[PDB]
RNA sequence: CGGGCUUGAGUUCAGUGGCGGCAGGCGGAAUUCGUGGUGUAGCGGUGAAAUGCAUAGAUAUCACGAGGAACUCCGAUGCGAAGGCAGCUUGCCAUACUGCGACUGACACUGAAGCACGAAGGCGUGGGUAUCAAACAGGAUUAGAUACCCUGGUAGUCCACGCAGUAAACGAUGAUUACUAGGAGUUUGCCAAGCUUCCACAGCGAAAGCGUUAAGUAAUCCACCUGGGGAG
RNA sequence: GGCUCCCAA
């Protein structure tokens, strides 16, 4: 996960109103998906990093719970975010 | 590598230096194998 | 890599062949190939001097540059190719001078890389250097025995040697066989190990593949008559006595290297 | 930050045989003792103090 | 970028010309890799605590620089490839260690 | 923490493993 | 938190057992009603409601018998827990300590004790037993 | 069902910390083998001996060469979901704790299935094979000795990939949440958290004992027990 | 004829 403050700020500006909104469900889902992809890339090389695995799984669980909250609150926002991120698979 | 440059006084000094270093204690320890569980439990009991 | 065949037939149940995952071209370079004739193990008098040779697929010979005397001319790796004449793969090179050559493909050499030969060459995989210029401890292959005569030593697929230390005009090298011996430091070697190390994992599966590769059936000596083999004869099965060849040469532990050979002065430790 | 250089400084925590003195012998606290041991081992690797 | 400090020892047989050649070779390799250099030092001849390669004296050189974390591997490959060097070490220095190094350079 | 309780289980395990090792290699 | 009413009862019980004089609880409407019922029935010395930026604080001053150094409250028991809810009619209202204790019960007429629940002929959820 | 709030929860920022994981490089002490030099009457081992190695030149000592394995002192603490993690260094990751005058606004807890990880020993393929050492062989001790002791010694112990899924896998103590006394030490960032260890009030317990890291006071969910053997 | 696939090239 090549993650830094500049990338986090760019993600928060892209998803969610204003760049200071680090806590929005959309911002959190975007951040989780970004580091999930990067951790997958790391694992394909370090196939024996069982600690980076299950950290990946805990990130996946967090993203799923945020998506379930979006289901319970506003379905249209969930459709928009999964369309913009290409999550469902 | 205990060095005692120099006869009774020299021999007493060498023996005292060897005792302070504790080479005989580690030699007695290295004469046999001890399980890590045995070492950990001995340390816990002591 | 290897490819394990599924057991659709009994002749395929135990067959493992190579995956051919490193080969990048299927056609050889026309100017560097020539048709090769076969021997059935027969010498120039027509007599069969070596048994169990004959038939097989038709093959063309590829000219391999085992000498590498184009010192200081960089070359580009063009293709990795199949060679029917050896267990390893080969690599096609284009020199900036405009020449072309084939070299033994080392492990890790990729299409698009640069290679060089001579003293000024960097000790990278695929480069050919005099042993005086190779850092101690490097994995090497294609080792010359005499300077200028061409690589002779470490050539089969997956094989490598090691430069253990140097002692002036001679360096010390550990061989694939486990022998340790001294080699003139003006002889050349190539950096890296020979590729296609999975060649040893292949299983023919059936007798037909040996026939394709050009081998003929080998007959045991105990199932012959005494007139043919010293180990033949008897009523029913018999052990044949002490194992030996048709000329009575013992086949268990009798040494055949000439006891007064001069090269034994350069052999530090022996292992067969 | 104790430097792996200044070996003369580094011998302050070593005994006559060159070994590392226990934390109870001197007044060190755990963080400083860990830093001292790391510096001593770095200098031993760099051949600034003997291994024996 | 990241602050690094490398200390390496050369054999005591080469002269000052070969000193300059080898140290400039390493410096140029770092510069080509893209590193800026903070401080190059030279402790000269030092008696090693233990013999290295059957030799008891060496030539100590220190380089503190800044680089991307990708050039360290190339630096060690060059170090291993060079038969003149006998013992090298590198350290990534944090904020506290960099502050100490800055104080040492100031003094 | 009597000891006989574990001794009985140890005996049973010994018997079962002996049975299995005797039955191996026979078909 | 799983049962705020049980937590309130536990805080009171632990303060009594430790011998404290004042216990502070996070505030809630039903908890305020329970505190009012306790003060009316005479189990606690006093109470106070504080409205800070949070949900608020209920400060309860307990009652000790200076004659015998014994608290006015002996047992507090939660009856209808989240894992098993209990509702009774006015005919089957429980009697606590043979009528010498109280049973705080929530009824459609409000939160009251089993005595007035029986009087008004209304049932509901049996919150707790106090004696 | 609809709306609101910030305490729970999470995201951000900052500070600090670590034998936490994976991967690449480097190092010294010790041990084994080979070659050469000095030297000759024993070495080794035990309660005592013998087997064993040695004048066709051992043990001992010096140098050259080669290879494998483990990391003294620090060092009892710390980290990790657990199993476990300790030479040095770097790269790539993960994560804990504290605070924020930042953000979202109950987004939480538990969890039958299922999935992942999971000491040692064991199995398959290929490397490697120094020490130690099941099986085995020899010498002793014994009424015998299929052992304890001694001398050898093969799988194994090491690496990569893949199986297997067990333990006194233990704190013999499932996970969350809130509350309730004192002493004595101890690690970390500022008196105070967040830990990590021992006496010990109330209370609990059959007792031994537990006691703010509960086996106390309560709430939620999961697992498991119902006399012993037969019988996992 | 070319195309596809394959290795024994
Ligand atoms: K045959
Ligand atoms: K004959
Ligand atoms: Mg016949
Ligand atoms: Mg017969
Ligand atoms: Mg048994
Ligand atoms: Mg159990
Ligand atoms: Na194995």
Residue G95: its H or E element: none
Distance separating alpha carbons of residues E26 and E79, to the nearest angstrom: 8
Residue G26 CA and nucleotide H24 C1' are separated, in Å, by 57
Reading the block at residue C6, the tokens are: 């599924």
Cα of first residue to Cα of last residue in chain D, in angstroms, is 25
Name the packing angle between helices A55-73 and A75-85 (round to 10°).
140
Residues 19-78 of A with CB under 7 A from strand H: 20-25, 27-28, 31, 35, 38-39, 42, 46-55, 58-59, 62, 65-66, 68-69, 72-73
Residue count of chain F: 27
State the best of D43, D47, D48 to mutate against chain E, taking most chain E CBs within 10 Å: D47
Neighbours of G40 (CB within 10 A): 12
Distance, CA C221 to ligand 1 centroid (Å)?
8
Residues 152-171 of C with CB under 7 A from strand H: 162, 164-165
Residue F9 CA and nucleotide H139 C1' are separated, in Å, by 38
Distance separating alpha carbons of residues C160 and C177, to the nearest angstrom: 10
Give Cβ neighbours of residue C112 (< 8 Å, ≥ 6 apart).
Answer: C76, C77
Q: Where are the alpha helices (DSSP H) in chain E?
A: 16-33, 71-81, 95-106
Query: Chain centroid to CA E53: how far?
Result: 19
Q: What is the DSSP string of chain C?
A: -EEEPPSSSTTTTT-EEE---S---SSPPGGGEEE----SSB-TTS-B-S-SB------EEE-B-SS---TT--EEEEEEE--TTSSS-EEEEEETTS-EEEEEPBTT--TT-EE-BSTTS---TT-EEEGGGSPTT-EEES-BSSTTS-B-SS-STT--EEEEEE-SSEEEEE-TTS-EEEEETTSEEEES-BS-GGGGG-B--SHHHHHHHTB-----GGGS-TTT-TT---SS----SS-B-TT--B-SS---S-TT-GGGGSEEE---
């Amino acid at each position: 996960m090549y993650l830094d403050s500049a990338k986090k700020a760019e993600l928060f500006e892209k998803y969610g109103k204003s760049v200071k909104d680090t806590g929005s469900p959309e911002s959190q889902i975007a951040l989780f998906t970004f580091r999930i992809a990067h951790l997958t890339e790391h694992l394909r090389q370090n196939k024996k990093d069982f600690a980076t695995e299950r950290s990946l799984k805990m990130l996946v669980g967090k993203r799923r719970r945020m998506l379930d909250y979006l289901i319970k609150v506003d379905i249209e926002r969930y459709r928009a975010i999964i369309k913009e991120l290409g999550i469902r698979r | 590598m205990i060095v005692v440059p120099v006869i009774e006084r020299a021999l007493k000094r060498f023996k005292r230096k060897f005792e302070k270093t504790g080479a005989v204690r580690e030699l007695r320890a290295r004469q046999a194998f001890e399980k890590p569980s045995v070492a950990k439990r001995k340390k816990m009991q002591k | 890599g290897i490819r394990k065949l599924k057991p659709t037939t009994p002749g395929q149940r135990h067959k493992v062949i190579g995956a051919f995952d490193k080969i990048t071209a299927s056609t050889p370079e026309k100017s560097l190939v020539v048709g090769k004739k076969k021997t059935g193990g027969r010498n120039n008098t027509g007599k069969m001097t070596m048994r169990y040779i004959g038939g097989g697929h038709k093959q063309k010979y590829r000219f391999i540059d085992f000498k590498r005397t184009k010192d200081g001319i960089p070359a580009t790796v063009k293709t990795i190719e199949y060679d029917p004449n050896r267990s390893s793969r080969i690599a096609l090179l284009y020199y900036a001078d405009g020449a072309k050559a084939y070299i033994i493909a080392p492990d890790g050499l990729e299409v698009g890389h640069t290679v060089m030969s001579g003293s000024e060459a960097a000790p990278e995989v695929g480069n050919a250097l005099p042993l005086a210029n190779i850092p101690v401890g490097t994995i090497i292959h294609n080792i010359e025995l005499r300077p200028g005569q061409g690589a002779k030593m470490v050539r089969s697929a997956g094989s490598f040697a090691q430069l253990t230390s140097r002692e002036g005009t001679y360096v010390v090298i550990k061989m694939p066989s486990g022998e340790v011996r001294r080699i003139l430091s003006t002889c050349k070697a190539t950096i890296g190990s020979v590729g296609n190390s999975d060649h040893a994992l292949e299983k023919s599966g059936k007798a037909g593949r040996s026939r394709w590769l050009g081998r003929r059936p080998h007959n045991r000596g105990v199932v012959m008559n005494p007139v043919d083999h010293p180990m033949g004869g008897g009523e029913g099965r018999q052990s044949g006595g002490h194992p030996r060849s048709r000329k009575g040469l013992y086949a268990k532990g009798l040494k055949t290297r000439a006891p007064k050979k001069h090269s034994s002065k350069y052999i530090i430790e022996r292992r067969k | 930050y104790i430097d792996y250089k200044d070996p003369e400084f580094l011998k302050k925590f070593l005994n006559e045989q060159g070994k590392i003195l226990p934390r109870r012998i001197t007044g060190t606290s755990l963080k400083f003792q860990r830093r001292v041991a790391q510096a001593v081992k770095r200098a031993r690797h760099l051949a600034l103090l003997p291994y024996v | 970028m990241n602050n690094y400090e490398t200390v390496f020892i050369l054999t005591p047989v080469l002269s000052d010309a070969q000193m300059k050649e080898a140290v400039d070779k390493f410096t140029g390799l770092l510069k080509q890799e893209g590193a800026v250099i903070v401080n190059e030092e030279n402790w000269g001849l030092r008696k090693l605590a233990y013999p290295i390669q059957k030799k008891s004296t060496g030539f100590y050189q220190l380089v503190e620089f800044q680089a991307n974390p990708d050039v360290i591997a190339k630096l060690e490959t060059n170090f291993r490839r060079d038969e003149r060097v006998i013992r090298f070490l590198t350290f990534r220095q944090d904020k506290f260690a960099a502050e100490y190094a800055a104080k040492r350079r100031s003094l | 923490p009597n000891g006989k309780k574990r001794k009985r289980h140890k005996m049973a395990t010994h018997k079962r493993k002996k049975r299995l090792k005797k039955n191996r290699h026979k078909k | 938190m799983t049962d705020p009413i049980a937590d309130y009862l536990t805080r009171l019980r632990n303060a009594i057992m430790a011998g404290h004089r004042v216990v502070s609880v996070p505030a809630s409407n039903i908890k305020k009603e329970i505190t009012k019922i306790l003060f009316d029935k005479g189990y606690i010395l006093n109470y106070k409601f504080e409205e800070n930026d949070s949900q608020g604080i209920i400060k309860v001053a307990l009652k000790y018998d200076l004659a015998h150094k014994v608290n006015a409250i002996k047992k507090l028991k939660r009856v209808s827990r989240p894992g098993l809810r209990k509702y009774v009619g006015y005919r089957d209202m429980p009697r606590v300590l043979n009528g010498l204790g109280i049973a705080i019960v929530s009824t459609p007429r409000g939160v009251m004790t089993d005595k007035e629940a029986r009087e008004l002929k209304v049932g509901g959820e049996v919150l707790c037993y106090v004696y």
